[PDB]
Structures are given as structure tokens and as C-alpha cells.
RNA sequence: CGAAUUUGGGUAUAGGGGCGAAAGACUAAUCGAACCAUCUAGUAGCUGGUUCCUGCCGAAGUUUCCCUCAGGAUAGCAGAAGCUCGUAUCAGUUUUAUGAGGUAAAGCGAAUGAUUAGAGGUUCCGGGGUCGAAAUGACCUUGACCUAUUCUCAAACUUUAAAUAUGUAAGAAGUCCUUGUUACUUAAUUGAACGUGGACAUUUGAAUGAAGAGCUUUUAGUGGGCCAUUUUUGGUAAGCAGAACUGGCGAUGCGGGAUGAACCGAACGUAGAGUUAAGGUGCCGGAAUACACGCUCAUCAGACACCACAAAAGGUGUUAGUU
RNA sequence: UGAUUUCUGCCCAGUGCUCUGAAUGUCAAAGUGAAGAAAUUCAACCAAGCGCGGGUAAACGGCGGGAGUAACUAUGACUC
RNA sequence: AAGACAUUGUCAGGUGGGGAGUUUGGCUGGGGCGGCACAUCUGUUAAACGAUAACGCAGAUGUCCUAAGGGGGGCUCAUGGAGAACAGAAAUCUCCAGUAGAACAAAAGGGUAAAAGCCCCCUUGAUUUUGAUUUUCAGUGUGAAUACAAACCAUGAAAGUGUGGCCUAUCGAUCCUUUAGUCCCUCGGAAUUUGAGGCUAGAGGUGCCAGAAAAGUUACCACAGGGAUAACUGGCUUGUGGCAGUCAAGCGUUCAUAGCGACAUUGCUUUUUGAUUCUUCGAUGUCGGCUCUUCCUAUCAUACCGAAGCAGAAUUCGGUAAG
RNA sequence: GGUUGCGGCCAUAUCUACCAGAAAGCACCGUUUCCCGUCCGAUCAACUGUAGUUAAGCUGGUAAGAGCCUGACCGAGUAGUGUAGUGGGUGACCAUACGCGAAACUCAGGUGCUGCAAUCU
RNA sequence: CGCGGGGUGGAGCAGCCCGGUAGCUCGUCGGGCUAGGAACCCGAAGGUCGUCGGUUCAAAUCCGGCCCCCGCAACCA
RNA sequence: GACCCUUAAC
């Protein structure tokens, strides 16, 4: 018959790594998670307790509960036509802080800092990010860079 | 007589008719599922702030 | 008998090797893959002619054996057994299955139709790509017509279209002809059993001087 | 499986409320009393004409039962029950497993 | 065809009963259980039918459970009724940032497993001999002890590792103070969580759009699906069986493919004019027997995707090209 | 079963049918046996039946394998 | 004559297809047989989130364990190399080398090296109470169980760890019975002691595993239906069947090709049979023969001809040819 | 800059074979009365700062070293692939358009970096 | 091409209340009986159990493959 | 009690 256990189809997902087996380096147990922190979920296959389900590998959530060894994570999961709020009790080895979250907080401070400098003089700092713009006009000098003319090559075997 | 066994055909289309809206977010989530030791202490701390605030704006 | 090759010409299924999940497969029809003066040296045979495929298909082990025997027999009878070195560069690793339908009587009464139709192994084939060499012949430059003709004769044993293409490498080496001579004037290339070893600029210099002595001795 | 005859576990007897020693015995299902309401109602239903009036199970599939250990606290006589996993062989007589002995 | 004969009338046997030299025969054209009335409009997940118009919206053949598989319940899809604001905290999309993945490809002188050939020595049982155990004996053969190569591979192998698809974030519920509270926590006003006062509307912290957000109740039908392209499993294959994503048909007319559910184009109130799409323009047939360069002559030419098939192999037939 | 004629072989292990009665075999109502209060378990050459033993096939029915062996072969009277 | 026996009446065991009533799964390339794809678990199919089918492939489950659970400590495994007095290929003993090539109950895949492996010590956290969560999912139940809270514990110097088994499987409703849980509540005219009934948590089991109590036959048959589904034709396919081709190792006395032709390989046909289930189950009359017409050509005969291992006769091969 | 103790990332750190190491620092170390487990004071436990041992550990250097890491218009815009056509091809497959884009290979470079507290001529 | 059993000396059977590293009968051989055959008596030999791979508590009985002896089902249109 | 057999080979 068919087989759908808890860890079915997890052969490579929960595989440890190449030359990264054994004990976990302790910085993962030194990281601190507060309620509201944005965390990623990458299950560590060596630690079998507090393991996320395979659905939650690669999912990013928000901490809502902090216990002795684990954090409660809220994750939005798509069930049918709507997202359901799921609550994961995950041990710290299976989570890490989202790096994009930390980068945006630096932008928040950088935006506030830039506003403070501009407010001293009113130079329209324009904190808002912009998409890559079409190139402006430029002049290409040819001195020392004479154009080298190219043609399609003939066909040949090379075997 | 054999029938069709399973297909997810048309299921994504059905789920998008009035569909995939995110769950509505609130200020003050429910404190169910959070540690009772924190919950019990939070109750006392919130009580004191209401008493402390009431004294200030008497 | 054997079912026609038309039934297995093309690459329809995933590679199905003999394995612990197969564990019972017919033997391959071709067991010899090196013919002619196989013990030769790379300086002996400077010319290489390739029989290459222009189709992504499958060749049965039986067709490989037929082409090999045909190509070998012509070269031996025309130019001598040890005037060439032919190496078939494909090995039949994909097993072909057959759903054995009954040619008995009362067939449909207990045939079960397409129920449980997963077939049993009945043959082996090599899965080749466009531009992949099937046959290679090492020989002398004065034997070009003979070994081209042998591959022309062997083309009739394969399905699909094949090209007889001359290699610009010396023998079975990876180096072009005039790139081989400069590497050979220097003591950079040493004769192995039938292939050759190469002087690398890397590794321990103590080993690189113990071998390739002519390279360092002026 | 092999289960000892004594077992220090939590006792809820309003007098222990802690870990104390217990005597360990297998559970026996007890004799089905006549004059239990179900039997009184059943005997009434089976009386007279009609045949068998209730189902009788036949499609038995388990080759095993669940062993229930009854535990009597040696302090306060408060009895307790717990059920073990399915096992085809159960023994309370604890013949300890010896590791490094020849056969 | 003189009898176990044929036969009239009377009589007897009545329906789970009779009668049967036996055929389930016969019992009033009824018999493997007669006929009549009633219960009885018996039940039916099954077949058939189901009666006016227009307008607006508009599906499903999928999930889970069921003696469930021609049925139900449930969720989904749909309708209706609405309810809570003067710029909707959103999106089948991109960008930026940040994750997750083991497929394609690649690899196998990288592990596992396969797999083709040649390159040193060595009586650690056995195949043999110059000489006869002649002592580790001036030889090769599985190598019973050795590394450098070499050809070819993997759905249930892999160091590496895309594309597409996918999670999150891009702020007013956000950010910057010796606590303000606590019974939690800390060695400790240490923190944690939640706060009071302070500083931030045309940029409120990417883009594009937004057709009003958000929310509730209730209920119909459906729960046989099928077909492109692409991925893909079983099968020699199938107008075969089975999956993935999407788009379609079902439920859909219209222009084109002569013709055709699905292909191409385009989706439809009633009309008019002008442009087009796809497809066409010798005649049928609206539209160049137009322009331009070649090629082909078939004693089965060829002639337009899906699509209504043709192959290997050959030809100083013809044309171009390479050495 | 199916005139006559000539015959009707072997098997009672099984299923029946039938005949029998030591019951440290089974065993229903009723009846008989502890103590305060009673509604409330037992035992019993416990009735038959069933079990135990015998008969019965013109009851239903059933009625075997393997290997070797004769001085040409083949076969197998014979032999395990 | 017979006798308080029989008989009769009531109750209680036995017997009782003579009779009655009822039942006698499901999936399924038709059904049956077979199997279990019916409750599950591993890898793959599976197309790098998740999901994902087939009677796809390769396997496994209904168990097992007072340790194989818990804690702590100490120590490294498989395997090769190096000696010995009967000791050898396998008894030890000692050094080396050794990323795990071992072991960890089982299937498989992950995971684990001062350990998760092996040995030793102490233990029962495989315990209480009842909530939150994850997976299947309707976000119901069941099974597993992830993180806590309030107790009691075990272990350890301690930090800590432990709510069974390194992780992914290893299982069970209503009703009834039974057990455990301070005679807690009720037995309703008032009491006391038995009995009974309640409340909470287990067990006894439904494997068709969200869980009926269940043997056949019908060739005497019936009904509602089904072309959702078999037994003809027809259609797709062409494996198998049949018929051709290319290559040319060989045969043919010393010669491939007169005639053949292996190893291969390309096809054609639908005069075989499978495969499928599209049409037809409110019915398309089925085998064969007889009869009769036409068509095809893959030519047996007859016309003309080419070739030969055609010296004549007779053949053989081939061409145009179905008149 | 050496070293020790505690660490972080966890080979640019590992592996092989040689060469070197002043002061500081394991221990050459020495011992078994005492706490401490056994066949073994070898490990482990405890006790001392001795002849003065750098022999080993450790650190550094070397090696056209193995491995590992970084990079590259090196291979290679190649393989692969998203989207498109009433493109080609009997088919098998392929070419083209708008995008994304590897891995081997080759060539170079690199021999841990670094936090806290001490200590050192 | 489905479902089941079985394979141990030349031959027939013992490991099937999970284990004596293989035993019991016939056959064969040796001796003795008898004036040789037979019959009889006394002794002996014979198979690492069809093959290969799995737990390593004497494991191969019990597990999974191939071969062999066979047996039943092979129907309704 | 049991007890079968006996040259083709002058």
C-alpha cells in the first residue's frame, strides 16, 4: 500500500551535510530569540526532538513563545483556499534568525539617520528605495581600444 | 468499472475564485499556548500597571 | 525468437540498470570491446576514425556484437589482424523489459490483460546520444581507406544514421596531432601499457624526475 | 515481556501524594455479574420468542491482549491501574537478563 | 389398437396444499408454489418524465469518512441576503534583500554499486615442468601480498548543482529614555512582556495595479469527466491505462483548419462604418494567373501545423558544396 | 435395483443408522445441602441426549505409489 | 383388561432442512480464480517547497524489549599489518593503522565517535493532573508526540537530562461487561444494612482496521438497470501472426549475390491472435456449409519476356500482367 | 611575537616525510603515606618542584607534496532550462527568438583566522 | 507462468511439543555358518542434509533467491 | 519350531 509517515520523502532534506556531521557547534545554542523575531526553519537531522515536519523546512515565521529549549513559531500554511495559523514547538537547532529581517532593521536605523542629517538642512533625502534605472548616456573613447572585428567561425569537427 | 483515482486538476482554480487571502492579523494575540509561568506573571504585571496608571491620572 | 529492434530503438524509459532491485538479467551479447592490435603503443597508430551517432537512441547488445564482428573481420582480412586497434565505446547497460503475452490457446481466459503488466528483463541495450562515438579505430595513415570501409560495413548493423568522422587526435589520445608531437619530442609523454602517462608540472618533483627522465635530461 | 513485582511510582491516595512502593499484579477481568443492569435487560430481551436478539462477534483479529498492571500501594492500600503494550508473552516473575554468560 | 385399454357422469383430494408410472409435470391458455380482494399509492442508492418569458450571477466531476465504488455526508466551487467606512494594511505580478530544495545537467583517474583493456614484483596451502623435495630455486598462469593508468554507466548512487516553481521581509500594531508594573527572570533595576509621557501627513520607508475593503448567515447543483502543449509512469503499442502544472472542452456560439467537442484566431446585447486576426488570394470563392531568385518532370510528382503516416538502403537523374 | 442367464469381489477408518450400560465424563428445570437479613453460588449410581464400546456397505460411499530384476534387446513372472 | 402407572396440563434439557425467516464483503483494465494496491511504514516512481495516481518498482507492519526505558561514567568500532611451544583460515595475548568501510530488535532511509555504539554503577520519568501544539485533517476522530505548567521522583559533583524505546510504522468508537478511583451522588413517603444505578480513568474488539452478528446452488429461474462492463463486427495498435527489404559471414566442387543466406537491421499488411473498451445490453440473429456477385494481388495456371549452377527435355528465380 | 587556560567559526586548520624551537609553557618528569576503581599507580587518583629533558607532545618552516579553501572573459555563454511559432525533420530529434545559466576541466593564489583572562628575556 | 507442498548415505525414513554439528532400516563390504549358492549369525563403511545469500545464544531447519519431484485451478458469456 | 537349491564344461 501507500506510505505517508511523518518523515516520508525526507531522505535528502533531513540529511546532515557533506563533511558536517556530528555535534552541533555551540553558537546555535547561544543565539537568543524573542517574541516577534523572524526565524527560518532548517531541520537538523541529528537532533530528533522538537523536529519540524518536512512541510516547514524552508518556512519563515514569527516567535510567539519561548520555553526552556524551544520557541513557539507561528507559520501561515495554505490549506485549501485560505491560510491557517500553525504553531510549531521547535527546538533551537532547527531554527535560525532571518537575515533579511536583520537587514531591514539596519535600513530602519539608516533611514532614521539619513532623515536626521537631511532635517538639519532640508535636502530631500528620499529614503524610498528605487528600482534599477535605465542607463544614462555615456561616451566610449576608442584610444587604446580600437574595435576588433569579429565574424562567425567556420564549422569544424574538434573530435 | 474503473474510475479516475485522483487529480488536483481545477483545484488551484477553485481555490482562487475567492481564495488565498492571508489570515487577518490582530494587535494583542491570544495568550493561549504561551508559557503559564509567563502568563501568570503577565497577569500580575498588567494589573499593577493599571493600578499604577490609575493613581497617576487620579 | 527475439522481438524486433523497432520496439526498443528510442529512449522512452529511464535508465534501468542491472542492480539489487533487478538482480536477474540476461547476459550481454557483446563481451569483447577491444579488437585488433590492442597491446599496441600510441606511436604505432597515429590515425583515428570514429563511427559516431547522429541520433539519441538505443543500440541493442546484439547489434553491437554484429557491427563489431563485421568491422573486425573486414580489417583483419584486408589489412591484417594487428594493423589496427578497434574499440567499441558503448556498453549495453540499460535492460529492456517485455510483457510476455501468450501465444498459447485460450489466451484471454488467463491473460489478465494489462493488469500487472510490468515486464521481465529480456535484453540489454546501450543508450547513445547525438555526436557520441560508437566505434573508434586506431591505425596507420596508410590504412585510412581500409578502416573507413570497415566502419562503413559496420554501419549496416545499427539503426539510425551514423557519421564516419576522422579524429584530429593522435590515436586514442586527447591531444591533437601536432600537439602530440611537441609533447612527444620533449620527454613529457611516457609509454604506459597501451596508453601513455603524462608529465605534469605538479606533484612532488622527486617523482616527476624518477619518471619521464628524458624531459629533465636536456 | 518481564515486569518486576514491585514498582516505586507516584501514588494519589490523599495521604501519600508522592512516590511510594507498590505491589505489581496482573489485572483479571472479574466475573460478569448476573443482576448487572445490562444482563438484566439482556436476559429480558432473550426471553420468549425471537432468537438471538443481539450481535455476537466472530471476526476476531487480535492474537494479543493488552496487559494491565494493577498496583497496590504498600503505604495506603490505594490501588492503581496501568496498561502495557500488546505482548504475546507476559511474565511478572522477574528473571533478570544476564548479559555476558555462555549458553 | 382386447388391454397397466379408451371413455361419460357421480364422488374425493385445494395452494408451501393437492396430485404426480416423476417431466418440476399437472392443478380452468396461470405453475420452480394457482386465482381473487385487501394490506398497498408496498420499498427502489435504479430507468423514464417533470408544463411560461426575459434579466443578472454562475459551477462541479475534487478533499475526508461511510458493506463506500451507479449512493450519501463533509469541505470546496455557486447564488442570495446582507452587515461594519469617505481612500480599504490587499494582489495567481515584478524588484530588492534573505532563506529552503537534490530535480535537469554533471561526476565516476570522487564515496556506494556497475564496468573495457593493457602496464612490476611475490610458492601465504593448490595447475606444471631445466634439473627431480635441491635451500625464499637466473619463467609464466588465477595475483593467495601491489599502485598508476584506461573505455563506459545508475529511478530506488553521488562531491557539485541549475532553470522553473517556493517561504519571509520591505514599518504608523514602526522606530530612539536611569524602569512604570510583576508573584516571572536576574548575582544585581539584570532582563522579559506590557506600558505613561517625549520625536517623526503630501516620500506613511521598492515597483505596478487595486475594479470599493473587511465580515457574516444561509442554501442549490456537483462529487462518471475528458482533450492540447510540456514533464512523466506501466505498456511493442494504442483514438490504451495512470499522475504533475497550465490552458481548454464539458457549459461555447463565431472566423479559419473542406469536413471534426478539444487545434489556430477570437469568446457573443441589437445595428452601422472602418480596420484586422488566424487563414487565404488560378476557378469553385472574397482576394495579385502579382513581383523576385532558384529548384523539380514523377510509365504511383507535389502541394501547408494538430492531421489523417512511411523507413533502412540505393540512382554519372539533376543541382549546389567539401576534400 | 430393474426380465432371463451368469455373477454380485475387498473396505465399518469417515458420515449416517442401530445395539449396549462400570460413569474419581458432560449434565437442564424441580428437589436436597452454610450463619446474621434476605434477595442470592454448589454438590447430586444428577433424565434423556452427547461422549465411551460393538454391529452394519443390496446404508451413503471408497477401493494406492516409488524403485530394481530373466545370459541380445524389450518386457517383467520375481523383488524390496 | 389396566392402575395411582399411563394419559392430560405446565415448565425444563435433547433432537429436529420436515418447516420458517435471513444472510452468504470490497477493490479489480468485465466478472470469477488469484492477489490486497481495504488500516499502515521506508526508498523510488515524484517532474529540487508541499501535494500527487496505476493490480507501478524494491521492501516492511499487527511484533519485540525491566532492558533494547531513564540518568551518569568509562571506553572505541569493522577491517587489514606485524609473533608464538601442540596454537593453524578461525581460541588468545600485544602493538600498529583505521571517518565508521561496525554496531544501534526489526523493513528501508536518515541519524549517532571522548556517542545515540560497547561495558559498568544507580534506577523506574514506561509515573501524577489536566490543558496547548504537529502530522493524516473536515483542520472531526484514531494512532503517534512536540513543547510546556503544576507535583513527585531518578540520576549526576554539577550544569542538566529523563512524561518509554536514536527518528520515521507497530493499531481501535457507541452499547454491554469488568477493574481502579476518600460509601462522592441517587434509589424519589422517612430511615439502617445488602443489592443496583451514577460520575472519572483503563481493559475486554471490531485487521472489511470511523468498527453487521451471516453458507451454498440455480442448466427452472425473476426484477431494476448497465454499452459506467464481458461474450461478434467495426475503430486505434501490431507485440505475436503473415509478407517484403538492406548488409553480406557463409552455402553453393576451386564462386557471396544462378539459387540461397547467419549475425544484425528497416519495414509493410490487418486474410492470425492478443491488447483496449470507443459504439451497441428499451437485442445489429453467432459456427459451418450451400448459393451468388464483385473486388484485391502478396500469380497456382494460361500470353510475352529477362536470368540461371538454362547445351535438349523438365525445373528454378524474376518482370509486365488479376484478362 | 611565544605560551597557557577558556572559546568562536570548524581542514586556508587535515594527512605524509624531513628540518628548527631562546625565555616563557606540557611535562623528561619523580613518588605511592594519604582520597581514589581494576590484572597492572599503564590510564585514573593523590604527593613533591628533583638530577636540570626538549627525545617525544606542541608550534613554526620546508615539499614543481596529497587533501582542503579562494578566484578566474579556463572551459563556457557550453550542458541544462523558463517562455514562443500553423519553425525544420517520416520520425528520432534539432535549429531559431526573448531570458536564466551549471558541473567537470584548466590555470593561478592560499598552509587557519580570530575573542577573553593571564604570563613571558 | 496462479496457488501449494516436498529435495537428508546407492534406496526408504529420523532435525517439525523450533538446536545432541546427522541417526535408523534395506542395499553394499568383511568374517563366520554350509561340501559352494541362498536363508541365518557377528561386525564395518557410506551422506558437513539440492545450491547461494541472511541472526552470529552449537543456526542451515525458520528467512529470501535459482534448479528439480510433483499436485490442484485453469470458467461465463 | 525352522531346513530352499545344486555341471553346459568330455
UniProtKB/Swiss-Prot annotation, chain A:
Cysteines engaged in disulfide bonds, as pairs: none
**Does the record carry Protein biosynthesis as a key word?**
no
Keywords, alphabetical: Cytoplasm, Isopeptide bond, Ribonucleoprotein, Ribosomal protein, Ubl conjugation
Tell me its family: Belongs to the eukaryotic ribosomal protein eL21 family.
Placement of covalent cross-link Glycyl lysine isopeptide (Lys-Gly) (interchain with G-Cter in ubiquitin): 31
**Taking the first listed entry, what is the main subcellular location of this protein, grouped into a coarse class?**
cytoplasm
Q: What is this protein called?
A: Large ribosomal subunit protein eL21A
Please state where this protein is localized. Cytoplasm
Q: What else does the entry mention about this protein?
A: There are 2 genes for eL21 in yeast.
Do you know which Pfam families this protein is assigned to?
Ribosomal_L21e
Assembly: Component of the large ribosomal subunit (LSU). Mature yeast ribosomes consist of a small (40S) and a large (60S) subunit. The 40S small subunit contains 1 molecule of ribosomal RNA (18S rRNA) and 33 different proteins (encoded by 57 genes). The large 60S subunit contains 3 rRNA molecules (25S, 5.8S and 5S rRNA) and 46 different proteins (encoded by 81 genes).
Origin: domain of life: Eukaryota
One GO BP annotation of this record = cytoplasmic translation
Q: Where are the transmembrane segments?
A: none
Q: Tell me, what is one Gene Ontology molecular-function annotation carried by this entry?
A: structural constituent of ribosome
GO (cellular component) term, any one: cytosol
Could you read off the lineage of the organism from its UniProt record?
Eukaryota, Fungi, Dikarya, Ascomycota, Saccharomycotina
Curated annotation (Swiss-Prot), chain B:
Q: Which UniProt keywords apply?
A: Cytoplasm, Isopeptide bond, Ribonucleoprotein, Ribosomal protein, Ubl conjugation
List where Basic residues composition bias occurs: 1-25
Name any one Pfam family assigned in the record: Ribosomal_L29e
Question: What Gene Ontology terms describe what this protein does at the molecular function level?
Answer: structural constituent of ribosome
Q: Which domain of life is it from?
A: Eukaryota
* Keyword Amino-acid biosynthesis part of the UniProt annotation: no
- GO BP terms, alphabetized: cytoplasmic translation
Cellular component (GO) terms are: cytoplasm; cytosol; cytosolic large ribosomal subunit
The family classification in the record reads:
Belongs to the eukaryotic ribosomal protein eL29 family.
| Protein name per the record | Large ribosomal subunit protein eL29
UniProtKB/Swiss-Prot annotation, chain C:
Find the cross-link Glycyl lysine isopeptide (Lys-Gly) (interchain with G-Cter in ubiquitin): 39, 100
- The main location class comes to cytoplasm
Q: Phosphoserine modification sites?
A: 142, 204
Q: Where in the cell is it found?
A: Cytoplasm
InterPro entries, alphabetized: Ribosomal_uL16, Ribosomal_uL16_CS_euk_arc, Ribosomal_uL16_dom, Ribosomal_uL16_euk_arch, Ribosomal_uL16_sf
Q: Where is this region: 2 X 15-17 AA approximate repeats?
A: 166-215
Effect ascribed to mutating residue 193 to D: In QSR1-1; synthetic lethal
The organism's superkingdom is given as: Eukaryota
Tell me the keywords, alphabetical order. Cytoplasm, Isopeptide bond, Phosphoprotein, Repeat, Ribonucleoprotein, Ribosomal protein, Ubl conjugation
- Mention one GO biological process in which this protein takes part, according to its record: translation
- What Pfam families does the database record attribute to this sequence? Ribosomal_L16
Family annotation (PROSITE patterns) = RIBOSOMAL_L10E
Gene Ontology CC terms, in alphabetical order: cytoplasm; cytosol; cytosolic large ribosomal subunit
GO MF terms listed in the record are: structural constituent of ribosome
Q: Which sections of the protein are sequence repeats?
A: 166-180, 199-215
- Sequence similarity: Belongs to the universal ribosomal protein uL16 family.
NCBIfam families reported in the protein's UniProt record: PRK04199.1-4 (NF003239), uL16_euk_arch (TIGR00279)
Tell me how this protein assembles. Component of the large ribosomal subunit (LSU). Mature yeast ribosomes consist of a small (40S) and a large (60S) subunit. The 40S small subunit contains 1 molecule of ribosomal RNA (18S rRNA) and 33 different proteins (encoded by 57 genes). The large 60S subunit contains 3 rRNA molecules (25S, 5.8S and 5S rRNA) and 46 different proteins (encoded by 81 genes).
**Can you name this protein?**
Large ribosomal subunit protein uL16
Q: Which organism is it from?
A: Saccharomyces cerevisiae (strain ATCC 204508 / S288c) (Baker's yeast)
Gene designation per UniProt: RPL10
Curated annotation (Swiss-Prot), chain D:
Entry's Gene Ontology molecular function annotations = structural constituent of ribosome
Localization, per the record, is: Cytoplasm
Matches recorded under InterPro entries: Ribosomal_eL44 (IPR000552), Ribosomal_LSU_eL42 (IPR053708), Ribosomal_zn-bd (IPR011332)
> Which positions form S-S bridges?
none
* Swiss-Prot/TrEMBL keywords: Antibiotic resistance, Cycloheximide resistance, Cytoplasm, Methylation, Ribonucleoprotein, Ribosomal protein
Q: Which Pfam families match?
A: Ribosomal_L44 (PF00935)
Q: Which SUPFAM superfamilies match?
A: Zn-binding ribosomal proteins
User: May I ask which residue range the UniProt record assigns to the signal sequence?
Assistant: none
Residues with the modification N6-methyllysine, per the entry, are: 39, 54
**Similarity-based family:** Belongs to the eukaryotic ribosomal protein eL42 family.
Query: Could you give the subunit structure recorded for this chain?
Result: Component of the large ribosomal subunit (LSU). Mature yeast ribosomes consist of a small (40S) and a large (60S) subunit. The 40S small subunit contains 1 molecule of ribosomal RNA (18S rRNA) and 33 different proteins (encoded by 57 genes). The large 60S subunit contains 3 rRNA molecules (25S, 5.8S and 5S rRNA) and 46 different proteins (encoded by 81 genes).
Name of the protein this chain belongs to: Large ribosomal subunit protein eL42A
Amino acid at each position: 500500500g501507500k506510505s505517508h509517515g511523518y518523515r516520508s520523502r525526507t531522505r535528502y532534506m533531513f540529511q546532515r551535510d557533506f563533511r558536517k556531521h556530528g555535534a552541533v557547534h555551540l553558537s546555535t545554542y547561544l543565539k537568543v530569540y524573542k517574541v516577534g523575531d523572524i526565524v527560518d526553519i532548517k531541520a537538523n537531522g541529528s537532533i530528533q526532538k522538537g523536529m519540524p515536519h518536512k512541510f516547514y523546512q524552508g518556512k519563515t515565521g514569527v516567535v510567539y513563545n519561548v520555553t526552556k529549549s524551544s520557541v513557539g513559531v507561528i507559520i501561515n500554511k495554505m490549506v485549501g483556499n485560505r491560510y491557517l495559523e500553525k504553531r510549531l514547538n521547535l527546538r533551537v537547532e532547527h531554527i535560525k534568525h532571518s537575515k533579511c529581517r536583520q537587514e531591514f532593521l539596519e535600513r530602519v536605523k539608516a533611514n532614521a539617520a539619513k532623515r536626521a542629517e537631511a532635517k538639519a538642512q532640508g535636502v530631500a533625502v528620499q529614503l524610498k528605495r528605487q528600482p534599477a534605472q535605465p542607463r544614462e548616456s555615456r561616451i566610449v573613447s576608442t584610444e587604446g581600444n580600437v574595435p576588433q572585428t569579429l565574424a562567425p567561425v567556420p564549422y569544424e569537427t574538434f573530435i | 468499472a474503473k474510475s479516475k483515482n485522483h487529480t488536483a486538476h481545477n483545484q488551484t482554480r477553485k481555490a482562487h475564485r475567492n481564495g488565498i487571502k492571508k489570515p487577518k492579523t490582530y494587535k494583542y494575540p491570544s495568550l493561549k499556548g504561551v508559557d503559564p509561568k509567563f502568563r501568570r506573571n503577565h497577569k500580575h504585571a498588567l494589573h499593577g500597571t493599571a493600578k499604577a496608571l490609575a493613581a497617576a491620572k487620579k | 525468437a527475439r522481438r524486433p529492434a523497432r520496439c526498443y530503438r528510442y529512449q522512452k524509459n529511464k535508465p534501468y540498470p542491472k542492480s539489487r532491485y533487478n538482480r536477474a538479467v540476461p547476459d550481454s551479447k557483446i563481451r569483447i570491446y577491444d579488437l585488433g592490435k590492442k597491446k599496441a603503443t600510441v606511436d604505432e597508430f597515429p590515425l583515428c576514425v570514429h563511427l559516431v551517432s547522429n541520433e539519441l537512441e538505443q543500440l541493442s547488445s546484439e547489434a553491437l556484437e554484429a557491427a563489431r564482428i563485421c568491422a573486425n573481420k573486414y580489417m583483419t582480412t584486408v589489412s591484417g589482424r594487428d594493423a589496427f586497434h578497434l574499440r567499441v565505446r558503448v556498453h549495453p547497460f540499460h535492460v529492456l523489459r517485455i510483457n510476455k503475452m501468450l501465444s498459447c490457446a485460450g489466451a484471454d481466459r488467463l491473460q489478465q490483460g494489462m493488469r500487472g503488466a510490468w515486464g521481465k528483463p529480456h535484453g540489454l541495450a546501450a543508450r547513445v546520444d547525438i555526436g557520441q562515438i560508437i566505434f573508434s579505430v586506431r591505425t596507420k595513415d596508410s590504412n585510412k581507406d581500409v578502416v573507413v570501409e570497415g566502419l562503413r560495413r559496420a554501419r549496416y548493423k545499427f539503426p539510425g544514421q551514423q557519421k564516419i568522422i576522422l579524429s584530429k587526435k593522435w590515436g586514442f589520445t586527447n591531444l591533437d596531432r601536432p600537439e602530440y608531437l611537441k609533447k612527444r619530442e620533449a620527454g613529457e609523454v611516457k609509454d604506459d601499457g597501451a596508453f601513455v602517462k603524462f608529465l605534469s608540472k605538479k606533484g612532488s618533483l622527486e617523482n616527476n624526475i624518477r619518471e619521464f627522465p628524458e624531459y629533465f635530461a636536456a | 515481556v518481564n515486569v518486576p513485582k514491585t514498582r516505586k511510582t507516584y501514588c494519589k491516595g490523599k495521604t501519600c501524594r508522592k512516590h511510594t512502593q507498590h505491589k505489581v499484579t496482573q489485572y483479571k477481568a472479574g466475573k460478569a455479574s448476573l443482576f448487572a443492569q445490562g444482563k438484566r435487560r439482556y436476559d429480558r430481551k432473550q426471553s420468549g420468542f425471537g432468537g438471538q436478539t443481539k450481535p455476537v462477534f466472530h471476526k476476531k483479529a487480535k492474537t494479543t491482549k493488552k496487559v494491565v498492571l494493577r498496583l497496590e500501594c504498600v503505604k495506603c492500600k490505594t490501588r492503581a491501574q496501568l496498561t502495557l503494550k500488546r505482548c504475546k508473552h507476559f511474565e511478572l516473575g522477574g528473571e533478570k537478563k544476564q548479559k555476558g554468560q555462555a549458553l
